[PDB]
Design a protein around this ligand. Sequence first.
Ligand SMILES: [Br-]
Ligand SMILES: [Br-]
Ligand SMILES: [Br-]
Ligand SMILES: [Br-]
Ligand SMILES: [Br-]
Ligand SMILES: [Br-]
Ligand SMILES: [Br-]
Ligand SMILES: [Br-]
Ligand SMILES: [Br-]
Ligand SMILES: [Br-]
Ligand SMILES: [Br-]
Ligand SMILES: [Br-]
Ligand SMILES: [K+]
Ligand SMILES: [K+]
Ligand SMILES: [K+]
Ligand SMILES: [K+]
Ligand SMILES: [K+]
Ligand SMILES: [K+]
Ligand SMILES: [K+]
Ligand SMILES: [K+]
Ligand SMILES: [K+]
Ligand SMILES: [K+]
Ligand SMILES: [K+]
Ligand SMILES: [K+]
Ligand SMILES: [Mg+2]
Ligand SMILES: [Mg+2]
Ligand SMILES: [Mg+2]
Ligand SMILES: [Mg+2]
Ligand SMILES: [Mg+2]
Ligand SMILES: [Mg+2]
Ligand code: NA
Ligand code: NA
Lengths: 252, 252, 252, 252, 252, 252
Amino acid sequence: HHNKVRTCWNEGRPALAGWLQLPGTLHAEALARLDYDAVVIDMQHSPIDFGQVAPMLIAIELGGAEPFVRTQVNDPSDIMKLLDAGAYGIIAPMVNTRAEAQTLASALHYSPRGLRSFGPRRPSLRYGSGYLAQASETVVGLAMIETREALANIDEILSVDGIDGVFIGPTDLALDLGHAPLVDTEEAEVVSAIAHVRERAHAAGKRVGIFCGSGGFARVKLAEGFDFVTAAPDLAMLSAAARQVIADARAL
Amino acid sequence: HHNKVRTCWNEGRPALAGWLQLPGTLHAEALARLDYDAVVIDMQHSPIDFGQVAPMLIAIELGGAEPFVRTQVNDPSDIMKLLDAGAYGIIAPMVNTRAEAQTLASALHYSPRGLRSFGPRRPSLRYGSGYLAQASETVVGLAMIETREALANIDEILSVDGIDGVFIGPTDLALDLGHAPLVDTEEAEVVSAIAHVRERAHAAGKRVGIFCGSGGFARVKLAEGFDFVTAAPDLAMLSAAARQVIADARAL
Amino acid sequence: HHNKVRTCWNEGRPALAGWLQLPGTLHAEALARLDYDAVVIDMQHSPIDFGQVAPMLIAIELGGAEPFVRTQVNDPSDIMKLLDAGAYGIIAPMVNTRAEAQTLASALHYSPRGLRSFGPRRPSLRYGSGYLAQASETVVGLAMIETREALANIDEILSVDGIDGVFIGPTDLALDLGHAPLVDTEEAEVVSAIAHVRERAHAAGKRVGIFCGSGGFARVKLAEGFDFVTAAPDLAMLSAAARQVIADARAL
Amino acid sequence: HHNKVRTCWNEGRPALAGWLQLPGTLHAEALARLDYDAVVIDMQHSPIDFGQVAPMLIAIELGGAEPFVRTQVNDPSDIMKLLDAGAYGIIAPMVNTRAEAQTLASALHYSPRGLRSFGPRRPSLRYGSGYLAQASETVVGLAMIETREALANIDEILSVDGIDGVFIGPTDLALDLGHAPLVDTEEAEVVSAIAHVRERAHAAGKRVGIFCGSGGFARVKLAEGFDFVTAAPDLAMLSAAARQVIADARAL
Amino acid sequence: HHNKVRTCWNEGRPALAGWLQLPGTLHAEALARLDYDAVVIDMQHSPIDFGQVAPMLIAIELGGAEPFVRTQVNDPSDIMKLLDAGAYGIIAPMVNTRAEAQTLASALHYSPRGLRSFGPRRPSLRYGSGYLAQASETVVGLAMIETREALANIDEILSVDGIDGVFIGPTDLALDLGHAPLVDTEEAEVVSAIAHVRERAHAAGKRVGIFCGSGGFARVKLAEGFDFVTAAPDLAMLSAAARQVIADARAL
Amino acid sequence: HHNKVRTCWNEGRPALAGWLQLPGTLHAEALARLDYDAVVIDMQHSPIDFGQVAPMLIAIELGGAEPFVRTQVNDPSDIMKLLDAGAYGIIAPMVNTRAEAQTLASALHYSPRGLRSFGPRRPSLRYGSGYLAQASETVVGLAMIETREALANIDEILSVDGIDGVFIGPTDLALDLGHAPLVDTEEAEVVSAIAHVRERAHAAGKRVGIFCGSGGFARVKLAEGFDFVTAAPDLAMLSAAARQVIADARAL
Ligand SMILES: [Br-]
Ligand SMILES: [Br-]
Ligand SMILES: [Br-]
Ligand SMILES: [Br-]
Ligand SMILES: [Br-]
Ligand SMILES: [Br-]
Ligand SMILES: [Br-]
Ligand SMILES: [Br-]
Ligand SMILES: [Br-]
Ligand SMILES: [Br-]
Ligand SMILES: [Br-]
Ligand SMILES: [Br-]
Ligand SMILES: [K+]
Ligand SMILES: [K+]
Ligand SMILES: [K+]
Ligand SMILES: [K+]
Ligand SMILES: [K+]
Ligand SMILES: [K+]
Ligand SMILES: [K+]
Ligand SMILES: [K+]
Ligand SMILES: [K+]
Ligand SMILES: [K+]
Ligand SMILES: [K+]
Ligand SMILES: [K+]
Ligand SMILES: [Mg+2]
Ligand SMILES: [Mg+2]
Ligand SMILES: [Mg+2]
Ligand SMILES: [Mg+2]
Ligand SMILES: [Mg+2]
Ligand SMILES: [Mg+2]
Ligand code: NA
Ligand code: NA
C-alpha cells in the first residue's frame, strides 16, 4: 500500500531500478525479486506492446518491485491506460518544453489537479476503497530530457507541479549534441550537460534520474546524488553474459 | 543448406549451443548471432508453448544458429509439428528405454526409415525441391539420459539407429541418484555416471552431449570429448548478471 | 444487413447494451446471445488492446448483438481501423468541444461527408457489394460527455452532423464536478447535469445514452427517455456474483 | 510460503475455491482477492491453453488465493510444466483406475516418491532455496471421479499414496449413470453415489472435493464434510448476472 | 442448427471444403463465405496451435461454413477440447488400426455411445437446450488413411460404428508406398489404392473423403463418388497466385 | 547489408513488392522468397497490430525481401518503434501537406537530419557497429497521396528532403474525387491524376510508387516508369484463387 520508489525518497534514499526490453513475465518476476526498488518496462525501444506489458506489470508487482513503464510517447490516453493496468511509475520520452511536461502531468492526476479519466481497474484492487484520496501519491512521473531543446527549457520543465522530476536519456542527448550515442559516456560536453540537469533539478527541489549501462557508472551516479538510477537493460546484460560464457567455453 | 551442428561434427569439431527458457524473438536472434552453433529452446522447464516457440525458430535461423528444441515430452506428433515449423534439432527428455528411443527415432525420419508425417511447411522453404532426399540429415536428434533406469539401459539406447546419440540431463540424474540437483556438480557418483555415459556413447560410435551451467564447466566437457555442450540458460545468466550489477551499484 | 441499434431507433424503441472490460471471445458471444441489442467493448478502462478486441467483434456478431467499442481516445485512425475490423458502433471518450466532436464525425464517414480511409475488410464481407452506398448508416457514433467543459459546450457538440448524439460518462462527470465518482449516483448536481444533457440532446433531435451500473438504474434511465443504455460491466457483475456465492457458501 | 489449501486442512477447516473457464488475468486477480482459498483454472472445458493459463497463475497468486488447475487430461508432462509455471494444485479429470491415479501421483513428487522432472522455474522463486525439501507439501493433487468405472474402483484409487484424495465431477457422473448432466442434481442415484465417494474417501483418511454450481449447494456440501468445494464457474455466474440485469432493465 | 456437411449428405450431395494452414480469422471468414460447405483447419502441418484455432472456429461459423479441424494427432482429450470450442468436424491423422479408429469414435460421443466428457461451452450456445439429445449428429468424424498398414486394415477401420468414414491422406500414402509424396498423383499404385479405399468405404455404407491440391482433381474425385473433397490449401493457393502476379508484372 | 529496394534504384531498376493484410509469419516468409524485392505489411486496413507485425518483419527478412510497413497513421513514435523492430521501409497514409511530409521525414533520420530516437534494437543486429553512419540509407520512406488536398500540395510534398518520394493510394484517391473506389481504375480523372503525380515526382527527381490490384496493371505501371509497384494483397489473391478452385471443382 505504498509506491516503493516514493518510499525510498520519503525515507531519504535513492531508488535503483531495472530496465526491461525483453517481453515476458518470468525474467520480470525474477529481476523484481532482486534488490531493485522498481523495474522499468521499456515500450519505446523494444517490441513490447500493450498486450505484452500488461502481464509483466503483474509479475513485477508479485516479485516485490514497483512496476514502471517508459512509454513509447508522451500521450495522455496511452499513459492513463497503463496506469489503470497497474503501472505505478511513468517515464515519458522526449519531453522538450514546459507544455509537453504539463501534458505529462495532466495524465497522472485526477481532477482537479489533472484530467486523468476514472476507471482504475488494477489500482483499485491493490489499494482498495481509499484509492481515490491517495491516487496521486501512488504514481511516480518523470519527464525525459534527451535533446538540446529540453536542455534549453530545463528550468521551465522543472517548474511543472504534477511531475516528480526528470529522467536523463543520455544516448539521445549525446547524439543531439553531435556525439556518439554511447551509454555511460565520458564526452565532456555530455557529462557537463548531465551534471547541469541534476544541479537544476535539485535547485528546483525536484527529483532527477538517469539511465545507466553498468553497475559501476550507476554507483557513481548515486554518489553524485541522482534520485533514480536504472541499471542495466536485460538484453544488454544477457548478451554480455552469453558472450563471456562462450569465450570461456571456447578458450583453450 | 546444412544443419550447422552436423557440419561441426562432419568437420571434426564439437558444437556449442545456447539454451533459452525465456520466450521471445529478440534475445533469441541476439544470442544466435554470437558464436553459438545452435540455440536450444526449452519447452519443458519454461513457459514456452508452441505459439511462442514458432517465431523464435525463425529468429534463431535469421541470427545464424541452428534452431533446436528440448521438448516437453518424447511425443511423436509434437516432435513432427516442431520439425515442420523449422526445428532442426530435437532433444527429448526422459528417454529411459530402447523402446522410447525407438519412438524418438520414428518421428525424425520419413518412411521407410521412420513414420514422420509429410507436410514440411518451413523445411521445404529453407531447403527447396531436394528436401525429401536429404531430410534425415537436416535434423539432429538426441535422447536425454536423466535417470538410473536410463543409465541401466544406456547401451540399448545407444544401439538405436535413428538418433544421433544422447544428451545428459545432469540435475535430474543427480536427483534420481539421491543427490542434490546441482548443475555442474562435483558429486563423485554423478560425475562417474556422466563419464560412463560419454564412454559408452563413443564406444558405440554415437554422439554425446551435456547441459552445462557455466562456461568453465563447458570448457572442461569439451576437453573431455563431449560432442554437444550447452551453456548456459538465458534466465540464469540474466539473473546472475542483474545480481552483480545491483551489487556493484549499491556498493559503497 | 442492418445495424441493430439503428433498427431499434428506427422502430421507435431504445437500445440496451452490454459492457465488457474482460478480454476474450467466450463471454462476449454468451452475452451477445442474451437480450442485448449491442455489446460495447471498453478499450479505455480495461486491458483490451487491438489484438484482443478483434476476435471479440467477431464473437459478438455471431452471438447476435451489434459490436460496439468505447475507444481509448478520440483518434481518427484508431477508430477507422476498428471500423474496418467490424466495430459498428463507436463511443469516443472525453469529447469536450465541437471541434473534437467534428474530429469524431470525420472518422465515421467516407468522402464527401467525412475523411474515412477506404479499405473495409470486414464490413465488405458482412454487407457485400452495396456497402459503400450504405456505409454511414451501418455505423453508430456517440461522443462522450464527461467534464464540466463538455457540459459548457453541450449545445455546440450536439450541432455536429456526423454523429448520432452523446453518451454520458457519469463517474468522470461526477469527479470533475468535485463529487465521488459513484456509478448511478444520487448526487443532485450530477443528476441535474445528466438530465440537462438528455434534455438538450432531445431538443437538438439527437440521441443520448448513459453508462449504468445496475439493471434498476437502467430501467429508470429508459423510462426517462434515454436512447442507449448500457448495463452493466462484465467484471463488476462477475465480482458481485462471486461475492454472493461465497457469502452463501460460507454462511452457517 | 504455504499452500493455502493445505493450510486450511492443517488448521481443521475445508477450502472453498473459485472456478474459471474464461481466460485472462483481470477477473482472475479480482476473484482471488475475495474469500476464496484457491481459484481453479479449467483447461478442459474452456478455451484456456497453456499460453493463457500462465499469466493467470501469476494473477491468482498476487490476488491472494492458491492457483489450481483442472487439466485437460491426466498427462504427466503436461502436469509437470504447469507445476513449474506455478500451479500449486492439480485436479486431473477422468481418473478411472488405480493405475491412472498412480500416474497422477508420479507427476507430483520428485524422486524417490515420484518421477517429476526437476526445473521449478516459478516455485523456486516463490519458495526460495529450501524448495526441494518441501516441494511435495507445496502441491495439492486430486483425482477426478466421473464415471461408473471410477466408482467401481474408488477404494483402490483412494489407496494411492501420492495424491491427497478425489474430486467429484458430478455432471459427467450423472451422464455416465444415464441421467441428465445437471449440476447440483437431486437425482437419487447420483446423490447416493456422491455420498458413497465421500464416505469412502474419509474411511480411507483422504480428502474429497466436489464441483458445485451454486453457493447454496456448496454450503450443504461443506456441512456434509467435503474438504474442497468449488463454486461457481465464472462464465455461468456472469451469464446469470447479465440475464438478471437485462430482465430488471427491460421490466415495465 | 444443423451440421452443414451432414446436411449435404442427408440431401444426397457431397461436401466441398476448404483447407487452412495459415492462422488468423480474416481469411477464414472470407473463405467460409464462399461456396464451401466446410472449412478444415490443419493443426498438424501448420503453425496453428489451440490458441490460434479457437477464434478461427468462430470466424468460419460466422462466414457460413461448418468449422472442421484436422488434428495434430488422434488424441481423445485434444479432440474433446476442440469439440467444446466449436469444432463440428474432426479429421484425425494416421489412423492405422481398428483400435485407433475406436479411440477416435470414443471422443465424439457422450456416454453410452462414447466417453466424451461433458462441458460443451460453444455447442450449447449454438444449439441451445436440446443439444445433448442431438450432440452426436452435430459432429462429423473421419479417420485418415495414410499408410500401408491403414490399407491393410481398411475393412476393420470401416466397421467402427462411431465414425462417419475415412479421409485419404494421399501424399503420406504415396510416400509410405515408396513413391514421391505428390498431391493429385497419377502414380498407378497410389491411384489404385485410393480407388480401393473408396470402393471399400462405399461397400461398408460409409463416407469417404480425400485431400486435393487443385480444383480439377477435386472435380474428378466428386465424379468418382467421394463424399468429402477438400481443395486447396490456403498457403499453396496464395503462393501460386503470388507467383503468377509476379510473372505477369515482370514480363516484358 | 543493403536495403534491397534502394539497391534496385541504385542499379537502375524499379522495385516490385508484395502486400500483406493477413497476419502471420508463414505466408510472409513464403512470399518473401518469391521474386519480390520487398513485402509491405498493411497496418491500416487489416487486423495487424504491433504484436503481430513484429515476427512478420523477421520472417520477411529471412525469406529474402526487404520488410516494409504501411502504417495506420503518420505518427512519429509509431514509425520509430517499427524502425527499431526492423521495418526498413515506411509508407505513411494520408500525407496531405508539406508539414505532414516533414513530420514523416523527421521520424526516419537521426539528429541532425531528423529527430529519430536512438535505440535500434534490430537494425543494430542486422547492420552491426557501423549502423549509425549508414542508418538513413537503410530506410526507405514514402508519403501517400490519397486526396484532392494531397494533389493540390503535390509539389510542396515532393520538395521535402527526408523522404524518398510518394506512393499513390488509388482507391482513396478515386473516392475523394467522387468516383468508385475501384483498384486499377480506368476512370479518366483518376488516371490523369495518377499520371500527374508521377510526372511531378520525376520532375522533382523523386521516386513514385502505386498500389496495384493485378499483375497486368502492375506491368503497365512499371512501363510508365513507376519506381515502386505493389501487387497484390494476399487476402484478395487468396480469395480469388479459392473462388476459382471452387468453380472448377463444382463444374459439371
Ligand atoms: Br540482489
Ligand atoms: Br545499455
Ligand atoms: Br560471441
Ligand atoms: Br543452470
Ligand atoms: Br436475456
Ligand atoms: Br459499474
Ligand atoms: Br468475499
Ligand atoms: Br455450473
Ligand atoms: Br464461391
Ligand atoms: Br497441395
Ligand atoms: Br517468383
Ligand atoms: Br486489391
Ligand atoms: K525487489
Ligand atoms: K510551479
Ligand atoms: K551463430
Ligand atoms: K542398431
Ligand atoms: K442479442
Ligand atoms: K449542424
Ligand atoms: K483470497
Ligand atoms: K497405500
Ligand atoms: K459457405
Ligand atoms: K460395426
Ligand atoms: K525475394
Ligand atoms: K527541398
Ligand atoms: Mg532516448
Ligand atoms: Mg531434466
Ligand atoms: Mg469516463
Ligand atoms: Mg467432468
Ligand atoms: Mg498426411
Ligand atoms: Mg488509402
Ligand atoms: Na496510438
Ligand atoms: Na499434448
